[PDB]
Design a protein around this ligand. Structure first.
Ligand SMILES: NC(=O)CC[C@H](N)C(=O)O
Ligand SMILES: NC(=O)CC[C@H](N)C(=O)O
Ligand SMILES: NC(=O)CC[C@H](N)C(=O)O
Ligand SMILES: NC(=O)CC[C@H](N)C(=O)O
Ligand SMILES: NC(=O)CC[C@H](N)C(=O)O
Ligand SMILES: NC(=O)CC[C@H](N)C(=O)O
Ligand SMILES: NC(=O)CC[C@H](N)C(=O)O
Ligand SMILES: NC(=O)CC[C@H](N)C(=O)O
Ligand SMILES: [Mg+2]
Ligand SMILES: [Mg+2]
Ligand SMILES: [Mg+2]
Ligand SMILES: [Mg+2]
Ligand code: NA
Ligand code: NA
Ligand code: NA
Ligand code: NA
Ligand code: NA
Ligand code: NA
Ligand code: NA
Ligand code: NA
Ligand code: NA
Ligand code: NA
Ligand code: NA
Ligand code: NA
Ligand code: NA
Ligand code: NA
Ligand code: NA
Ligand code: NA
Ligand code: NA
Ligand code: NA
Ligand code: NA
Ligand code: NA
Lengths: 150, 150, 150, 150, 150, 150, 150, 150
């Protein structure tokens, strides 16, 4: 990757539906090359794919939660718990972090009932779970994970 | 939105680079209509846009952090603090949550130094901040915010 | 339910011992209809019943407590613990809440001894209990659960 | 108050809509006396009033919260904060408790938006507030404050 | 007990080595009666005994600790743990309290080594102990348990 | 102090109302000497005094509390707060401890009302107080501060 | 040890590569004696050895951590856990402390990966571990353990 | 630095008082070269110096503490507090860490009194300090900061 690739990426991270001509015109390079570079980035694994950004509200996803989960120590409980949490429907993020040395789980549901049935009841039944604390998100100030180049 | 739109969205959320023919063939509808429905979803605000999914590692984003920030009470400190946190370079997520009644801030940096200079030093200088606790992410078990339809 | 029912309910929630004439005169409708509406609300389940509001002090209920109880994870411990807590004499409120992801238990006793014997000793013997923290209420600033329409 | 009054109260706390004949027949005393005793209890302040028990769901009160609020020390901040919390629409319970030496506030709202506008925004603007932690109630196992005699 | 007994007690709690004449002269009553009242208080259990107040420093008791101990729930673990803590040499106070719903243990030792061997090692070996937190006392602002009448 | 003084003290700490003959007979020394040693211990400050042990229940001291108080940093707030806490009627113990780096305050009152008026209201009005947490003692397993020699 | 030894030590703790002449000249004593005193201190165990102070950065030790580890109670779990933590490669400090009544573990690694593989995975597999909380060091303001004489 | 330098350093970190012949014989290289390499490491800053390892007990350093200090937010309070803590006599370690987002301070004193006068009183007077929590070290399982190569 070179400074040119970064300029290309800084555009595709925002709008992947731009025309090669408009892009090639903004970055100042042969539209034929731009196409090559983009294809190269895809193969090299820089660009993993293209996604449609769907508005969660449009899907009635009104019950947004961020849950900290502590796992019991020993055997391979920690790793096992992480993968179980990642396969729960509605869960889009699972991170293991230092400090609280636990898992931070991001999920979205349409309502409290759905959250209870699909997420909480499932989590409460996992023996390896030492403690879980769910924080209800009441305001999304910002959520642009797609922006990696500031 | 109808059951057909959901089927279309369940595809575009994963791969927006599919061909209309392959999509129209999977859902079983006139490629001409599919195109109309997709265009409608865009105008109605369901599909807000299309983004390229860039691998953070490819950008050397190795210092990933999740920080809880508590704001001092009174005046309009809470709302002000939220917007200040959202404009910090590297910060892609800001949520106000109940429980700890604070802000959960998601950010990514290439190194500790960059994190300190761009994020921490900035946060430590904000007077409205009562307390901040940063959790270093050492393992991303899952991060697929694009998946809204399970 | 219509705006008229709400006006009726806003009265019955405060004083269910009012005369139909005084009520019918305040809301401005045929006393015969008012009676019908009230009867309808009862059948439809809006009005579940009528209770006498007894002053706790009159019963020497001087030891008022609010206890947070955390349940151990696994099997069906959480649900089981909730129902056990609800059947303890003196306990009038049991809620499962997010944040501390535990149970908040409201109870009233005449003295510390009664609290110990009927509530605490019972709770300390429940194996599914991970931790319990009792907060002694020393001042009831307000307690009007009957007011649902402000 | 005597053992007879307690038997009367144990009935009125459950159903104040019983007939004097049915009550007088259950307790075994002159319906004329029962009426006197009940009237006496009202004047002596034992029976403060009669209320209609309205089902919160019937009013779409789906966002139920229990919030702990800590007040800053000094002057008369504590007492002032307590009364401010009690006058917030939707708040039916306010207790000052030992342990966390703070206020436990019970409130009900129809939705998150209403909760934010009427309760949280109001609380976040109170300078005397040191910290507030809201626990979202996701399950009401039991809520019978009217039962004072077990 | 009458106002006269309280005046007598308010003296004996401070200095039990006073002369009956000086006491009888301060309270204004027949030295013969004073003696009777004091004897009565002893039998009735008001005055449980007379102790010599020894200066802890004189005994090289330099390692003073206050430890909170949480017991595991179930069976009769709580009560058992309390009595075990009370029989540890050096422990003069054991209280079960609400809030942290645990035991507060007061002890005194000459040094850290003695504290470790006699108190901590013993406590760490008790299975019923869920958690223990020792606070080292570095300054005794006041310690007059003998004063019960202010 | 020698081994003989310790034997004398081990007796006086339990019962200072023993007869010199019984003591001299138990320790095996001239009653005349025993008297000298005891007098020496008093002057040297080992024995600070003799107190009557009064049963708190006999004084209706039913509301027993242990409160942790955190002081604000700066100036001489810490030292000042300590002395203010020690002069509150009902407070018999005040210790500054490490760990929570705060004050542990022991007090006794006859009732909740008295506790509120004499202790809590006073503490809540002290500006230097950052936070206070009161633990209600519901069971005194052991309280023998007089025993310094085990 | 005398005041002269302290002066010698105050030098050797900073720079053990000084010449006997320069040292003997600064302290004002026969270089032959200085040599004797130093040899005596070594045998008496005051000076345990001489070490080269290596700059951690020079070894790419960029992931510095301080971890609190709580051990389960009973048997000899506490002591066993302490020694296991001390034998983990990268761990240079292990202390058992009061307050949190746990272990504080100091370690250094070149990267997050190394930290995970050598330290965290190892710690997460220890059954005796109740909880562990790792604090990532982002700035070493001072680290001069060699200075014992200020 | 090469594999040879590491072998040299792995020796000097343990015993810098070895003879060049013994070292040159263990690593298998010209004693003349070894000397050059060591001199190079010193200039390049790898070896910052040589220190005498003094046994803290030999200096009566019996009161060992690890203190967490939280700084108030705003201005440049954080950085200022860090340097103030580093200049306190007895303090050998100061680290700013993530998680608790505060300072971890390592210090050693001969007694509690010295700790109070030199460390605690000083820290309690710093206005920028929000909270400080001192953990008394009662057992040093391991303290070998000099070992950087395992
Ligand atoms: N479109 C451009 O910017 C240049 C055109 C380029 N030569 C091509 O092959 O398309
Ligand atoms: N491609 C299809 O699935 C149908 C073709 C459609 N009639 C069109 O207008 O393209
Ligand atoms: N009481 C009223 O307000 C109107 C009387 C009504 N017509 C009835 O049937 O009783
Ligand atoms: N109803 C009863 O139980 C007795 C009647 C009673 N004598 C009256 O005055 O009504
Ligand atoms: N000593 C007094 O105060 C009065 C004496 C009292 N009459 C007695 O019997 O000793
Ligand atoms: N009472 C004793 O034990 C010995 C008596 C002692 N000789 C005295 O002077 O009293
Ligand atoms: N070097 C000195 O300071 C004095 C020399 C000393 N007489 C010796 O034996 O070396
Ligand atoms: N001492 C050795 O290992 C080799 C000696 C080396 N030739 C020197 O110059 O000292
Ligand atoms: Mg996307
Ligand atoms: Mg009622
Ligand atoms: Mg005494
Ligand atoms: Mg060294
Ligand atoms: Na969190
Ligand atoms: Na993991
Ligand atoms: Na939302
Ligand atoms: Na907000
Ligand atoms: Na990562
Ligand atoms: Na609570
Ligand atoms: Na439940
Ligand atoms: Na009350
Ligand atoms: Na109050
Ligand atoms: Na509900
Ligand atoms: Na405590
Ligand atoms: Na008990
Ligand atoms: Na002391
Ligand atoms: Na002090
Ligand atoms: Na008691
Ligand atoms: Na710590
Ligand atoms: Na140990
Ligand atoms: Na560093
Ligand atoms: Na800093
Ligand atoms: Na030590």
């Amino acid at each position: 990757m070179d400074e040119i690739d970064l300029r290309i990426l800084k555009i595709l991270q925002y709008n992947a539906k731009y025309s090669l001509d408009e892009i090639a015109r903004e970055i100042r390079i042969p539209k034929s090359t731009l196409s090559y570079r983009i294809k190269k980035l895809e193969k090299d694994g820089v660009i993993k794919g293209y996604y449609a950004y769907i508005n969660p509200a449009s899907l009635n996803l009104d019950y947004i939660v961020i849950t900290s989960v502590k796992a019991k120590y020993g055997k391979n409980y920690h790793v096992e718990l992480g993968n179980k949490l990642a396969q729960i429907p509605g869960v889009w993020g699972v991170y293991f972090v230092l400090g609280d040395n636990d898992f931070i789980v991001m999920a979205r549901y349409k309502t409290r009932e759905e959250f209870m049935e699909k997420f909480l009841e499932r989590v409460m039944s996992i023996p390896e779970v030492e403690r879980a604390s769910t924080q209800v998100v009441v305001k999304i100030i910002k959520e642009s994970p797609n922006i990696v180049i500031f």
